[PDB]
Design an enzyme around this catalytic site. Sequence first.
Site, PDB file in Angstrom:
ATOM      1  N   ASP A 183     -14.585  17.877  -8.143  1.00 20.19           N
ATOM      2  CA  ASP A 183     -13.603  18.858  -8.601  1.00 20.19           C
ATOM      3  C   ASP A 183     -13.091  18.370  -9.955  1.00 20.19           C
ATOM      4  OD1 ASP A 183     -11.723  21.031  -8.608  1.00 20.19           O
ATOM      5  OD2 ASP A 183     -10.192  19.670  -7.828  1.00 20.19           O
ATOM      6  N   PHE A 200     -15.019  13.815  -1.597  1.00 24.61           N
ATOM      7  CA  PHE A 200     -14.479  14.644  -2.662  1.00 24.61           C
ATOM      8  C   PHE A 200     -13.989  13.758  -3.798  1.00 24.61           C
ATOM      9  CE2 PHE A 200     -14.647  18.623  -0.369  1.00 24.61           C
ATOM     10  CZ  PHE A 200     -14.562  18.241   0.958  1.00 24.61           C
ATOM     11  N   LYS A 201     -14.229  14.204  -5.028  1.00 20.30           N
ATOM     12  CA  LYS A 201     -13.744  13.533  -6.233  1.00 20.30           C
ATOM     13  C   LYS A 201     -12.813  14.515  -6.937  1.00 20.30           C
ATOM     14  CE  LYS A 201     -15.256  11.222 -10.490  1.00 20.30           C
ATOM     15  NZ  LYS A 201     -16.165  11.414 -11.659  1.00 20.30           N
ATOM     16  N   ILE A 202     -11.509  14.330  -6.755  1.00 21.21           N
ATOM     17  CA  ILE A 202     -10.510  15.233  -7.309  1.00 21.21           C
ATOM     18  C   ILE A 202     -10.093  14.696  -8.672  1.00 21.21           C
ATOM     19  CG2 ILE A 202      -8.339  16.416  -6.917  1.00 21.21           C
ATOM     20  CD1 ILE A 202     -10.668  17.020  -4.953  1.00 21.21           C
TER      21      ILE A 202
END
Lengths: 303, 303, 304, 302
Positions: C139, C165-167
């Site tokens: 993201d 997830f990579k925010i």
Amino acid sequence: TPRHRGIFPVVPTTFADTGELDLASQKRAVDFMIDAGSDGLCILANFSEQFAITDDERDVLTRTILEHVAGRVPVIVTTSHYSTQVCAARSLRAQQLGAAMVMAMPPYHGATFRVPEAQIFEFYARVSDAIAIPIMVQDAPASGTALSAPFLARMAREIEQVAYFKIETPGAANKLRELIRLGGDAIEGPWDGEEAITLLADLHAGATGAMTGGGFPDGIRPILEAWREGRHDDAYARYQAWLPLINHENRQSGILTAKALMREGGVIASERPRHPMPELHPDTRAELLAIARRLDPLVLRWA
Amino acid sequence: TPRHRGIFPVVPTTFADTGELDLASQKRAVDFMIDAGSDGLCILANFSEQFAITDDERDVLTRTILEHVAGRVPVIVTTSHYSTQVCAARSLRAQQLGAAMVMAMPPYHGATFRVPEAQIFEFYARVSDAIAIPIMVQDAPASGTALSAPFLARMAREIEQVAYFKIETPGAANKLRELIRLGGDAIEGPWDGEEAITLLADLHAGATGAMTGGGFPDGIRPILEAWREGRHDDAYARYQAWLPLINHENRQSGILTAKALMREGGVIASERPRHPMPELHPDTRAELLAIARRLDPLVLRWA
Amino acid sequence: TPRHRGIFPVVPTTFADTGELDLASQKRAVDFMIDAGSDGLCILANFSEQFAITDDERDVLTRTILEHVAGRVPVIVTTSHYSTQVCAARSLRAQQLGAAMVMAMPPYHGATFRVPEAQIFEFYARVSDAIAIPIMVQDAPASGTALSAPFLARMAREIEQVAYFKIETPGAANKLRELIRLGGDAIEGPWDGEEAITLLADLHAGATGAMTGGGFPDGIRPILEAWREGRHDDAYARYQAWLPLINHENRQSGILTAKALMREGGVIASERPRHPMPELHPDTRAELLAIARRLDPLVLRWAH
Amino acid sequence: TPRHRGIFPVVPTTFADTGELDLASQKRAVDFMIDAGSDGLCILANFSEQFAITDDERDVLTRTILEHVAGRVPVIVTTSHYSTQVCAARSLRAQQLGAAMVMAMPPYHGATFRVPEAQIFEFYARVSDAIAIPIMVQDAPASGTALSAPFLARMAREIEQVAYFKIETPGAANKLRELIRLGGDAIEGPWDGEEAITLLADLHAGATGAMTGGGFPDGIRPILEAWREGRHDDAYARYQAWLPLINHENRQSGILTAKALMREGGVIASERPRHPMPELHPDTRAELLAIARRLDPLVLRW
């Protein structure tokens, strides 16, 4: 069923060459647009150069236009503002003066200030609580804000006065279909805009209204009437005839299209925009009038 | 040589819990920020939530703050507006009420309404004609407008009042480097912004002023003075100490960082933003105050 | 609980001066980054200048880097592509060379080509159906694609391999909070990125991993160590000490931060990006080494 | 006096329903578009779904299409890539396989990776040093990269192979006026694109070539022919007749317009895009055919 249908063109803001508000030209442009067959009027929208006027001028025009319309056609007053309380105030202010409807962008500012969906919902909910007239949600690229079809439908169902929509983001026809499918009977008025450039495709999708430019409502309105009465071949015929003018307004002359037509026809005194918006290129205006004269619109034969 | 330099923090706009302007708290915020050692103040900027206030509220805040400051520190009044004539009139009004300088973005609106360079130049040229105080050009992402360093130096040399610049687009240090090289002594005020997150790099590039948040200018200011007198290791030391607080302002608490510290310190009555700007997440606020209570800023020990 | 956590810095792509791949310098950085204490590595990401390399170089680097790692640490291979079948084929190929995880941006191209949510969901569902290794959803601003926390959580619940997830979007800390609350057990690895500029706020939010720059993993890893061990005050102090260097990487030297540190430290032969990415400004490079030399990073004392 | 002018429609990439390249339909597409009167062809552009194909497919398609053209018409090969050397090597390979010209966006990636003006100038200057065929600079929204008219004029006056332009940014006609004036004799071909939606205004501004969709070049080309011959009223007439179809391609069916028309006409086997590009809404497809069937296009009688 719906309170409001048909063509609701955007009223341009008339300035004198000094840059001040020219209200005499303003009432004449309203009279012409009324005499052109408009089912209603939308004021202080983007094609009205609303971003270039002041709060005081905005107040003057809402009284001036509403009192001069005198109840001939319903008026949509655009009340967009980042602050919820300011928008609710303007919207309530509009209804007292006789507005039939208020239109509002989602709250935003410039290129970077955006509002989460949760607070966008609260924004429209509180404007709805403040007024008794319906709200038109504007889904346009200028806001830089994504309003999905499920979210738009959810507001129309969960917020009382949210009932109308101006879908003019890319792919409006498909989005109009999904908006109508998901909102059900809470979608009172699914409308399009963008100068009616995709009107034929949007009417296929179920659009029951069109917020067009103010130059030639007479040229576009028979497309909607022929569509409502099932005369689809007549609809394509008129659309194809006026599409080059629609396309020129959408792509070349832009905001100043209506004013350049209203000035050539002696309807208003000055077609100038407010500085620093660039004025029309002389060739762009030349091609606009050349196309417009093949179609003989009322604006060029009204004064 | 230059008229102004140092730290010029942004004064937040203090509302009541109802949302109306809280002028009593607004005067307290000015007096605290003056007491924190601020060289000057800038009002009605983005960290003042200017996009959420009306024109009347602008004039109310411009007079009330310029009257309360009583010439103690110079005040920059942000006067940005799409219309050239509106910005020029706001800028002359600010000058008449005692402003030392005005700050204006290039003319823009939302995500799509942009102005070409030629008309941007005319915009600043006409605002400079109307006033006798310096103009600060703002180079910020919120405008969505490209202002190249050759064009910025172009304006400083060939427009009278254009002498100050607030650079906070990405890579601001290297832009400050190119702006000073092309513009020379015409660049009277190469300043940075963005809450002083890049101040150290921008000081290397030659920045002489900083427009920061309004919560802890006493914490940031020693780095400008330490750089002014060549103590770059002292400058790094104070930079490293306060950067976690600055980073939390830039990335987490944002615009509301100043009002959160003032409200905790009893400086103002309410830290609430004007709706629909999201309120601070409770964890974000607690983490903000945890880092602040570690550095003893004046705002937590002033009332 | 999770399969992977800790620091997972991005491996830069090392070119020679004239722009061709320098696999010799490519392997040394991999060795260095493992020496610096990396829990794992991510290859072919943005800080790897992945947009500047060809498909053949992608397979060369994936094959080379994974074979040089020899199972020392897990490797995340970035397989982003607009096409579903291309990304899925890349992710299966990566899995077959020893990849522990794949990271994929949502499908996009340029400034204007975007994909509706329903087809983004189908994209990841087919990439998941093609492999048997976890998927990390990225993201990030580069895609210009909005992925809400309810949508991401739904993908983690309804799509098997979607678990990490990579925010990296603005407000990543509060988005991590909403992702974990909405996703629950489906959220295996709520991680952050952006060179660990918001790490302390993100660790507060529940972040269990960080994809950082590759120049100084030894400097950043103690922050997460002290955090998982409850030494909150020691984590802040370590975060505050290295923040001027993290900040300089995030704002000033950018992608080339890792390569400039590795070049000066003798780890790689050339720091130069592939044209036309601008080279590092001399002042910006000097201030980077000045700040780094205050922190004694391994990259400036690696004798291999 | 320019080497190239007229209509140069974009050759779509024909996939199977399964997503693989359908080269058999690909050659038919090329043959139909040449049969439809195309002065030339442009391959691997945005309407070819260039972003959905790999480098190997890119190479295979350039070989197949050029060999199937056999020099019948000039071919423009789109070679855009962030890396300068990668774009140079693609443009050289295109040249050695017989490409008359190459088209390249400025270097860019996604929504956030932009390249300053000076390095853009070096990007085009270096691709020019490597090849001996003209370059078309693509000024389009997908790159998110602003290229002013003086800058574009400067690249052509000062870089040898930069000689053509495809102007697709909003307000293309007025930008073409400025570029033509500033560029002088150095601009060999100021062209427009965007499926010919602004073709009339762009012809007024001096456009000498048009990069259109591939579904009906026979329908658009008489507009350029009439304009060059000075028959401006006839040019408007054919423009009005085909504008509903142009408008539908630009706003409704998009990239899939050409493939949907060719599939219906039997030119190609499958009109599907590569997932995850959405498939055509069935109502959009039905409206497209309804408009096309009012105009007797070659694609529906080939």
